[PDB]
Design a protein around this ligand. Sequence first.
Ligand SMILES: [Cl-]
Ligand SMILES: [Cl-]
Ligand SMILES: [Cl-]
Ligand SMILES: [K+]
Ligand SMILES: [Mg+2]
Ligand SMILES: [Mg+2]
Ligand SMILES: [Mg+2]
Ligand SMILES: [Mg+2]
Ligand SMILES: [Mg+2]
Ligand SMILES: [Mg+2]
Ligand SMILES: [Mg+2]
Ligand SMILES: [Mg+2]
Ligand SMILES: [Mg+2]
Ligand SMILES: [Mg+2]
Ligand SMILES: [Mg+2]
Ligand SMILES: [Mg+2]
Ligand SMILES: [Mg+2]
Ligand SMILES: [Mg+2]
Ligand SMILES: [Mg+2]
Ligand SMILES: [Mg+2]
Ligand SMILES: [Mg+2]
Ligand code: NA
Ligand code: NA
Ligand code: NA
Ligand code: NA
Ligand code: NA
Ligand code: NA
Ligand code: NA
Ligand code: NA
Ligand code: NA
Ligand code: NA
Ligand code: NA
Ligand code: NA
Ligand code: NA
Ligand code: NA
Lengths: 194, 119, 237, 46
Amino acid sequence: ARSAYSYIRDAWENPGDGQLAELQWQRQQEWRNEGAVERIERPTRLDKARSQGYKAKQGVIVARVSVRKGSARKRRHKAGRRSKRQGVTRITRRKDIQRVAEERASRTFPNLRVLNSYSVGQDGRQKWHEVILIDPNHPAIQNDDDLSWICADDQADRVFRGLTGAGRRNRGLSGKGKGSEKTRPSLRSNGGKA
Amino acid sequence: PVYVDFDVPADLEDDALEALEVARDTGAVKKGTNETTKSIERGSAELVFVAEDVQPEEIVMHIPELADEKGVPFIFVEQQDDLGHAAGLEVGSAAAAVTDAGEADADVEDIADKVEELR
Amino acid sequence: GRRIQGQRRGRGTSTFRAPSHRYKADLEHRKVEDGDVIAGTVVDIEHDPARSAPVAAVEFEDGDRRLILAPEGVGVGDELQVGVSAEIAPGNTLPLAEIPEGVPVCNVESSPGDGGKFARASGVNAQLLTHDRNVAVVKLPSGEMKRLDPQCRATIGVVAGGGRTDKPFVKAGNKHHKMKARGTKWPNVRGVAMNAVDHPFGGGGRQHPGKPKSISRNAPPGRKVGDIASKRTGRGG
Amino acid sequence: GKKSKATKKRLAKLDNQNSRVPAWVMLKTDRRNHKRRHWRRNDTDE
RNA sequence: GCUUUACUGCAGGCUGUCGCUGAGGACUCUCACUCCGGGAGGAGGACACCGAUAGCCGGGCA
RNA sequence: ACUCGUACGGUCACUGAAUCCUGCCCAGUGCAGGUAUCUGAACACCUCGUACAAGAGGACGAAGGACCUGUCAACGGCGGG
RNA sequence: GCACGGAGGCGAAGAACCAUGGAUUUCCGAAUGAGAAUCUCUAACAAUUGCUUCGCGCAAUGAGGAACCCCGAGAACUGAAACAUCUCAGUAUCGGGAGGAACAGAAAACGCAAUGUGAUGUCGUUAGUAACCGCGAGUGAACGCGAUACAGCCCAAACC
Ligand SMILES: [Cl-]
Ligand SMILES: [Cl-]
Ligand SMILES: [Cl-]
Ligand SMILES: [K+]
Ligand SMILES: [Mg+2]
Ligand SMILES: [Mg+2]
Ligand SMILES: [Mg+2]
Ligand SMILES: [Mg+2]
Ligand SMILES: [Mg+2]
Ligand SMILES: [Mg+2]
Ligand SMILES: [Mg+2]
Ligand SMILES: [Mg+2]
Ligand SMILES: [Mg+2]
Ligand SMILES: [Mg+2]
Ligand SMILES: [Mg+2]
Ligand SMILES: [Mg+2]
Ligand SMILES: [Mg+2]
Ligand SMILES: [Mg+2]
Ligand SMILES: [Mg+2]
Ligand SMILES: [Mg+2]
Ligand SMILES: [Mg+2]
Ligand code: NA
Ligand code: NA
Ligand code: NA
Ligand code: NA
Ligand code: NA
Ligand code: NA
Ligand code: NA
Ligand code: NA
Ligand code: NA
Ligand code: NA
Ligand code: NA
Ligand code: NA
Ligand code: NA
Ligand code: NA
């Protein structure tokens, strides 16, 4: 039959209805007084967490990250700029809020590397995402077949190179077909046209 | 808190855990929320235990409604490690299950009733 | 076009900032747990560089020594009280509700606890007109009828130093000295004397504003000069 | 102007480099100090 | 470089609408959120703030 | 920032000591206030249409404007017959 | 040592010279106990983390590198015979970061439509073709074929 996890996963399909909504309205209050990068002891979304790589092991860390809601906090051009490049309000970044979160976090925990991330709500002026990090210098993980690879040197500061899962999704590398002409194998080797 | 729709007095609570200990030595108990949840669906459960100090709550919110549409009686426990320890574990447990008790099928039944009256 | 002078101020550079390090203290009321027991003695009378008005030094029972806004008629040796059951004597600070109607009051709280806000400058005063369990209507020096929470504290009497404005500065030298002890740029070059580039009223073959002086509230900073959202001008009529 | 123990060493080195190439190196190379710093005409660092 | 009722824009201000956002064309309330308070609590209250959109103005700027 | 500030203030402008005075014009332009009716975007609401959508139309209508008032120590004006 | 003087010394105890491994290796410097124009003042992983015997106990990050690489931020002169879309150009420049290479990668793919191909780069071609564009100036792929090199895997959950 259905696992206990499948309940949590279903509840989160509509975070505005039922018990979860009654929960969000509560926590969020306590969440708004909390700092930007806070280390929590256990995943809010246990299912998603596990389904992303989570494990109750030594060297596996989770954390919530709050970011201001909005569009390009872009300063207006000071020198001569033609009508088209005269934007400040409308234009938005080419990097999604979730990815910004992953970085603020990886930085906060220098030595740790980023496994994955996931949304955990949002109100009228901020969005929250939890982050799974791993300590690639801890024998538990160096010995764990299922996470071992994250220790590889060429995995260091991966979130910053866009190597996340949320990264490749942002880079337009989902479909192996139509549309990916300008994105595979990388944006820079395609002249940045996506 | 949100799934907790009633308060369980300390003594009644003590009685539940006492029974859980002899049950783990005579009958059968299930540790952890996954195993416990599966019982309520398989029907092989008689009495379920749910800690009140669970964070994040989601891990448990489903128990109350799921057990009620399957008839299976339940109970709220304050501590986590008390349920965890009581089930013969060194850790703690969000929820445990009474899959066919032992030497207390009477006590268990009565307890499940006192709760039925506790609303 | 360069930024107008009003925009430079917003940065808060040295030229515009107020000489805080030179100032004495923020005159706020005294926070009392309750009882009204709090009472002190007027030790001295000083001059506050920040308001050009006087100020009274006071020493309470519990050891506290803090300078307070000195109303008119307070002298060295006198006694003041702070609280709900305080006496209705000039200077004694207490909530509006306890104060009898028709009595001149100063240093009025805009919200209870803030420590005063209204009626603070040279020789001014508010006026307590009405009472209620809910409201307390005060007449601020500008004539406005301010509706207040009767729980807001306020000092009895008029602010000292009255009549300062009465005598003219007589000379640029004297104004200069007043301004130096304030966060204001002085002197002032009329925008019509500046160049085209430096201010909307600038340039031209003569000194005159090309645009009509009155201007809309909605106008962006950089253009918001002259008669702002004037409901009218002149005196005639 | 006052100086530090450090600066005082730098000045000193700067003065030693300001000496001429030994008459003996002349004969050894069978045949000029390109870093001759006068006090007035030239300016050191700092 | 400067100007304006030159062309096209842009900040910015005003305004409707969307979300934040809840309870019973006008109204009550409190739980979010705001502010004051050292605190207890006080004031405001689904408004304000903020994100999006839409119309008006818009040499302050390009 | 102003602000350790609170209308006897601080901001924004014009005129430029004292003395005697400072006329008439609100039409236009500007700012401010009101406005029955008229104009006025988008969402939601309606009909139409499309098994959905594009799209046609209806109703309601904010600020703004029309319209009226105020105002020149507000831009400015103070003639011909 | 360059560097061919003078004095002197070293080498058959096999010096010089070369190769490899080792020793020493002042102060500043990411510079890390704290302060400072290379020095100073009275025990130090400063700062941020992880594991934690919760004791800096065990560890991690920091900064450099010709260019290459990856993710972000992103011009204008100029072309259009002016000029606003467009062009220059995702160029220059800026921010963050990895390795010896990076990135990508084992189809919710292709759609010579098929009874067909079978991870991803890259080279040649398709092709200046299709597509875009005040339809102006100009911008401009893919499937496929021919080659190079080939390689395939693991969780999550069900059930324990
Ligand atoms: Cl990382
Ligand atoms: Cl003044
Ligand atoms: Cl093929
Ligand atoms: K251009
Ligand atoms: Mg103050
Ligand atoms: Mg005056
Ligand atoms: Mg000043
Ligand atoms: Mg002047
Ligand atoms: Mg001039
Ligand atoms: Mg101008
Ligand atoms: Mg003049
Ligand atoms: Mg004039
Ligand atoms: Mg505050
Ligand atoms: Mg211009
Ligand atoms: Mg140091
Ligand atoms: Mg040009
Ligand atoms: Mg050209
Ligand atoms: Mg590549
Ligand atoms: Mg053309
Ligand atoms: Mg291009
Ligand atoms: Mg193709
Ligand atoms: Na990191
Ligand atoms: Na694109
Ligand atoms: Na002028
Ligand atoms: Na010199
Ligand atoms: Na010029
Ligand atoms: Na007129
Ligand atoms: Na008029
Ligand atoms: Na060495
Ligand atoms: Na270290
Ligand atoms: Na430690
Ligand atoms: Na040209
Ligand atoms: Na030209
Ligand atoms: Na073919
Ligand atoms: Na075009």
